[PDB]
Design an enzyme around this catalytic site. Sequence first.
Site, PDB file in Angstrom:
ATOM      1  N   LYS A 166     -57.447  15.271 -33.741  1.00 22.20           N
ATOM      2  CA  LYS A 166     -58.619  14.818 -32.985  1.00 22.20           C
ATOM      3  C   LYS A 166     -59.377  13.723 -33.743  1.00 22.20           C
ATOM      4  O   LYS A 166     -60.577  13.493 -33.508  1.00 22.20           O
ATOM      5  CB  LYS A 166     -59.541  15.998 -32.599  1.00 22.20           C
ATOM      6  CG  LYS A 166     -58.855  17.366 -32.364  1.00 22.20           C
ATOM      7  CD  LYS A 166     -57.777  17.333 -31.278  1.00 22.20           C
ATOM      8  CE  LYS A 166     -58.328  16.699 -30.003  1.00 22.20           C
ATOM      9  NZ  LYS A 166     -57.251  16.322 -29.058  1.00 22.20           N
TER      10      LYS A 166
ATOM     11  N   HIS B 120     -49.700  15.582 -38.532  1.00 28.33           N
ATOM     12  CA  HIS B 120     -51.006  16.043 -38.993  1.00 28.33           C
ATOM     13  C   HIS B 120     -50.809  16.929 -40.206  1.00 28.33           C
ATOM     14  O   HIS B 120     -51.769  17.587 -40.666  1.00 28.33           O
ATOM     15  CB  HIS B 120     -51.726  16.902 -37.951  1.00 28.33           C
ATOM     16  CG  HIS B 120     -51.983  16.226 -36.644  1.00 28.33           C
ATOM     17  ND1 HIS B 120     -52.578  14.986 -36.541  1.00 28.33           N
ATOM     18  CD2 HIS B 120     -51.765  16.649 -35.376  1.00 28.33           C
ATOM     19  CE1 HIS B 120     -52.687  14.665 -35.261  1.00 28.33           C
ATOM     20  NE2 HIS B 120     -52.208  15.661 -34.537  1.00 28.33           N
TER      21      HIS B 120
ATOM     22  N   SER C 238     -64.667  17.860 -30.946  1.00 27.39           N
ATOM     23  CA  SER C 238     -63.424  17.502 -30.294  1.00 27.39           C
ATOM     24  C   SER C 238     -62.416  18.647 -30.400  1.00 27.39           C
ATOM     25  O   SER C 238     -61.851  19.089 -29.383  1.00 27.39           O
ATOM     26  CB  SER C 238     -62.871  16.225 -30.915  1.00 27.39           C
ATOM     27  OG  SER C 238     -61.917  15.604 -30.067  1.00 27.39           O
TER      28      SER C 238
ATOM     29  N   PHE D 266     -57.775  15.957 -22.151  1.00 25.37           N
ATOM     30  CA  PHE D 266     -57.442  15.465 -23.490  1.00 25.37           C
ATOM     31  C   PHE D 266     -58.351  14.282 -23.834  1.00 25.37           C
ATOM     32  O   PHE D 266     -58.918  14.191 -24.925  1.00 25.37           O
ATOM     33  CB  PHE D 266     -55.962  15.045 -23.603  1.00 25.37           C
ATOM     34  CG  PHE D 266     -55.562  14.649 -25.003  1.00 25.37           C
ATOM     35  CD1 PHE D 266     -55.079  15.603 -25.902  1.00 25.37           C
ATOM     36  CD2 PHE D 266     -55.710  13.336 -25.446  1.00 25.37           C
ATOM     37  CE1 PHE D 266     -54.734  15.254 -27.206  1.00 25.37           C
ATOM     38  CE2 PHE D 266     -55.363  12.980 -26.748  1.00 25.37           C
ATOM     39  CZ  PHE D 266     -54.876  13.942 -27.629  1.00 25.37           C
TER      40      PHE D 266
HETATM   41  N1  LIG Z   1     -58.642   4.676 -26.770  1.00 27.98           N
HETATM   42  C1  LIG Z   1     -59.508   5.576 -27.263  1.00 27.98           C
HETATM   43  N2  LIG Z   1     -60.716   5.198 -27.751  1.00 27.98           N
HETATM   44  C2  LIG Z   1     -61.599   6.099 -28.241  1.00 27.98           C
HETATM   45  N3  LIG Z   1     -61.335   7.413 -28.309  1.00 27.98           N
HETATM   46  C3  LIG Z   1     -60.158   7.925 -27.858  1.00 27.98           C
HETATM   47  C4  LIG Z   1     -59.146   7.018 -27.292  1.00 27.98           C
HETATM   48  N4  LIG Z   1     -58.087   7.768 -26.926  1.00 27.98           N
HETATM   49  C5  LIG Z   1     -58.414   9.052 -27.223  1.00 27.98           C
HETATM   50  N5  LIG Z   1     -59.643   9.150 -27.779  1.00 27.98           N
HETATM   51  C6  LIG Z   1     -60.346  10.376 -28.248  1.00 27.98           C
HETATM   52  O1  LIG Z   1     -59.835  10.810 -29.508  1.00 27.98           O
HETATM   53  C7  LIG Z   1     -59.829  12.253 -29.586  1.00 27.98           C
HETATM   54  C8  LIG Z   1     -58.416  12.813 -29.658  1.00 27.98           C
HETATM   55  O2  LIG Z   1     -57.819  12.341 -30.855  1.00 27.98           O
HETATM   56  P1  LIG Z   1     -56.301  12.677 -31.229  1.00 27.98           P
HETATM   57  O3  LIG Z   1     -55.527  11.523 -30.604  1.00 27.98           O
HETATM   58  O4  LIG Z   1     -56.332  12.655 -32.740  1.00 27.98           O
HETATM   59  O5  LIG Z   1     -56.037  14.053 -30.645  1.00 27.98           O
HETATM   60  C9  LIG Z   1     -60.544  12.708 -28.338  1.00 27.98           C
HETATM   61  O6  LIG Z   1     -61.911  12.629 -28.734  1.00 27.98           O
HETATM   62  P2  LIG Z   1     -63.140  13.324 -27.994  1.00 27.98           P
HETATM   63  O7  LIG Z   1     -62.696  14.719 -27.624  1.00 27.98           O
HETATM   64  O8  LIG Z   1     -64.181  13.218 -29.078  1.00 27.98           O
HETATM   65  O9  LIG Z   1     -63.402  12.476 -26.771  1.00 27.98           O
HETATM   66  C10 LIG Z   1     -60.175  11.605 -27.362  1.00 27.98           C
HETATM   67  O10 LIG Z   1     -60.995  11.579 -26.189  1.00 27.98           O
END
Ligand SMILES: Nc1ncnc2c1ncn2[C@@H]1O[C@H](COP(=O)(O)O)[C@@H](OP(=O)(O)O)[C@H]1O
Length: 288
Positions: free
Chosen positions: A41, A101, A131, A248
């Site tokens: 996240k 991860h 998150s 997600f």
């Molecule tokens: N293009 C983008 N720009 C900003 N945040 C993004 C994104 N794509 C995904 N996220 C956010 O990054 C987090 C997921 O990260 P990962 O890819 O490591 O699982 C989620 O955060 P939030 O739940 O804070 O919105 C998701 O909504």
Amino acid sequence: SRPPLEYVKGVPLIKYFAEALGPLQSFQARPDDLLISTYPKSGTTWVSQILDMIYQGGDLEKCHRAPIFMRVPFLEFKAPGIPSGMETLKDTPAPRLLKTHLPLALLPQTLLDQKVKVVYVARNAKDVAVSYYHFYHMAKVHPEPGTWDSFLEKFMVGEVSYGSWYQHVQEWWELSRTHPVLYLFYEDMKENPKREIQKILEFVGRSLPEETVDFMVQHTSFKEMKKNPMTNYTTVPQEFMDHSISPFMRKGMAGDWKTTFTVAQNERFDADYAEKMAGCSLSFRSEL
Ligand SMILES: Nc1ncnc2c1ncn2[C@@H]1O[C@H](COP(=O)(O)O)[C@@H](OP(=O)(O)O)[C@H]1O
């Protein structure tokens, strides 16, 4: 069906990801591979699209070939019926993009020997925690998250899938002093994606036209990535990920944690945090 975690070398992992570590001993890395490493996240799907788009020369049609989990193999993945990240990996052509991860204690040594390039993304711990909590709810393979307060307590002692955020970010920072690692901050990507995409390009030894770059800034935006079914994870079984509980692509903000963190929780976290990040020059931004 919501099984508990299984510990291996001091890391808590999902039942299946732990099993997946067996076959993963067989994994042979290539010097042209590129590893995407993050604590969960912290922006993995973000930087994956960025990187795949770069690898596809900017062609959004080539990026639509398969979902991002089929395009960027997830090293330690496994599920019932859904093929392991290793299975998927057999079909994936070079130069490959890989996601993990795993902390160093568990990282396939093949990857460090082969001098593989690492793009690492870090994000502020408060936002990560929030998150992660919502993710736990929607991602059915996770244990029961319980209440926000309990989940946060776990998060501080690293008793969540993949363990301690605090160790993950320091160890890969340390690693960046003896290994080719581009260490990115989610909040810098929030601040100025173009600046950050330029640094990736430079790192990956590629060069692209201004037009293509700007085109990427937009198709890697939260709003674009939310609509794009090849990146928002909606093509997966609802039994595996239930977007009805939480998407997600939830918010994509820097600083939003403040609408979940109580003041007492905020005060206890800051105190705990100052101790854990004492002898470290790592510097995070909580907002803006
Ligand atoms: N293009 C983008 N720009 C900003 N945040 C993004 C994104 N794509 C995904 N996220 C956010 O990054 C987090 C997921 O990260 P990962 O890819 O490591 O699982 C989620 O955060 P939030 O739940 O804070 O919105 C998701 O909504």
